[PDB]
């Protein structure tokens, strides 16, 4: 054998994480869709009762 | 004009809410088996057609309300009690006070209708992507039309007194 002309080693290969562009309505994530609708139905319900 | 838009709305809200609680096509889960209120009829469950009743058995107070679905039914009972109160405009007229008794029942059913869903969603969850069928959206119209009929029944009572 001659002198090593290139060094190497056992490396790890994982899937490159994408940019993960958030959705247009990403701000509606902390509250579920059921909560947002129930708020609107409770909003109109309180208004009619108040009237 | 508004005297007739209330009687047609009571029969278009009670007759529409009783259908949403009758047909069992509220929730679509995954085989894909469509769900319902009192019983779910399975599909693609190793059998062609199967439809069996669900078995629900201080958190026990929520399970009995989900099993004995009284809130989505109490709203239909108040819709018919208020539907006959506005029907008393012809017979025994000139009272000017029985119309107010209908404006209370028309909104008391809306409070018992939004509750019937809170006890239904909290018990549903208590990954698996589930959707709401066309039969579940019918109950939503039983609350919107319950508020328009609750603003049109009281407005007449104010005009009659003024
Ligand atoms: O008997 C019934 N009353 C109801 C009132 C509202 C809804 C509803 C609608 Cl119309 C759209 C989206 C979510 C909904 O329910 C929520 F709880 F908000 F998730 C369903 C109903 N069924
Ligand atoms: C009832 C209709 C509810 C519609 C909810 C749409 C939410 C979409 C979120 C991601 C949007 C990406 C453009
Ligand atoms: C343990 C299961 C109890 C089921 C109770 C069902 C009650 C239904 C009442 C319907 C009344 C209609 C008028
Ligand atoms: C639960 C036994 C009676 C089922 C009646 C189903 C009626 C479906 C009507 C659909 C109208 C759009
Ligand atoms: C397990 C038995 C269920 C029977 C459901 C009857 C629903 C009647 C609704 C009447 C509304 C006015
Ligand atoms: C998630 C789709 C519905 C979003 C409704 C947002 C309502 C905001 C005001 C209550
Ligand atoms: C859909 C028309 C009403 C069906 C129910 C009639 C009364 C049943 C009482 C057990
Ligand atoms: C699908 C929900 C639409 C909500 C529109 C705004 C209601 C105040
Ligand atoms: C006199 C018209 C009242 C309309 C109220 C609508 C509430 C959603």
Contact check, Cβ <8 Å, B110/A45: yes
| B149: closest chain A residue by CA | A48
Phi and psi, residue B53, nearest 5°: -85, 145
Using alpha carbons, list the distances in angstroms from residue B118 to A16, A45, B12, B72, B108: 42, 14, 24, 11, 16
Question: How far away, in angstroms, is B117 Cα from ligand 1 center?
Answer: 7
Contact check, Cβ <8 Å, B111/A38: no
User: B109, B75 in Cβ contact below 8 A?
Assistant: yes
User: B146, B13 in Cβ contact below 8 A?
Assistant: yes
Q: Say how many C-beta atoms besides its own lie within 10 A of residue B83's C-beta.
A: 22
What residues of chain B lie within 8 A of the CB of A51, using their CB?
A: 151, 154
Phi and psi, residue B125, nearest 5°: -70, -35
CB A39 near ligand 6, within 6 Å:
yes
- DSSP-based three-state secondary structure for B131: strand
CA gap B39, B21 in Å, rounded: 11
* B49 DSSP 8-state letter: S
CA gap B33, B6 in Å, rounded: 39
CA gap B154, A28 in Å, rounded: 36
Q: Say how many C-beta atoms besides its own lie within 10 A of residue B39's C-beta.
A: 12
Method underlying the structure: cryo-EM
User: B146, A49 in Cβ contact below 8 A?
Assistant: no
- How is the beta sheet containing B131-132 ordered, strand by strand? B33-34, B27-29, B131-132
What resolution in angstrom units was achieved for this structure?
Answer: 3.9
* Protein residue whose Cα sits closest to atom 6 of ligand 9: B148
| Interior angle at CA B131, CA B24 and CA B146, nearest 5 | 65
Using alpha carbons, list the distances in angstroms from residue A27 to A18, A30, A38, A41, B131: 20, 7, 17, 20, 22
For chain A, positions 1-51, list CB contacts with chain B under 8 A.
Answer: 34, 38, 41-42, 44-45, 48-49, 51
User: B56, B67 in Cβ contact below 8 A?
Assistant: yes
- DSSP-based three-state secondary structure for B34: strand
């Amino acid at each position: 054998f001659s002198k090593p002309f290139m060094s190497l080693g056992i490396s790890i290969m994982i899937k490159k994480p994408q940019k993960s562009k958030p959705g247009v309505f990403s701000f509606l994530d902390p509250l579920a869709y059921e909560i947002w609708m129930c708020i609107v139905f409770a909003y109109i319900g309180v208004s009619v009762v108040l009237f | 004009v508004q005297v007739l838009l209330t009687t047609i709305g009571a029969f278009s809200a009670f007759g529409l809410m009783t259908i949403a609680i009758s047909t069992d096509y509220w929730l679509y889960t995954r085989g894909l088996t469509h769900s319902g209120l009192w019983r779910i009829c399975c599909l693609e469950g190793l059998k062609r057609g199967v439809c069996v009743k669900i078995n629900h058995f201080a958190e026990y107070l929520l399970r009995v309300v989900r099993a004995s679905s009284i809130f989505p039914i109490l709203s239909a009972i108040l819709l018919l009690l208020g539907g006959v109160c506005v029907a008393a405009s012809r017979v025994y007229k000139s009272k000017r006070n029985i119309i107010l008794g209908a404006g209370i029942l028309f909104v008391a059913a809306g409070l018992s209708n939004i509750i019937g869903v809170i006890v239904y969603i909290s018990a549903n969850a208590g990954k698996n992507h589930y959707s709401y069928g066309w039969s579940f959206y019918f109950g939503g119209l039983s609350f919107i039309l319950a508020e328009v009929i609750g603003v049109l029944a009281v407005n007449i009572y104010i005009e009659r007194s003024r």
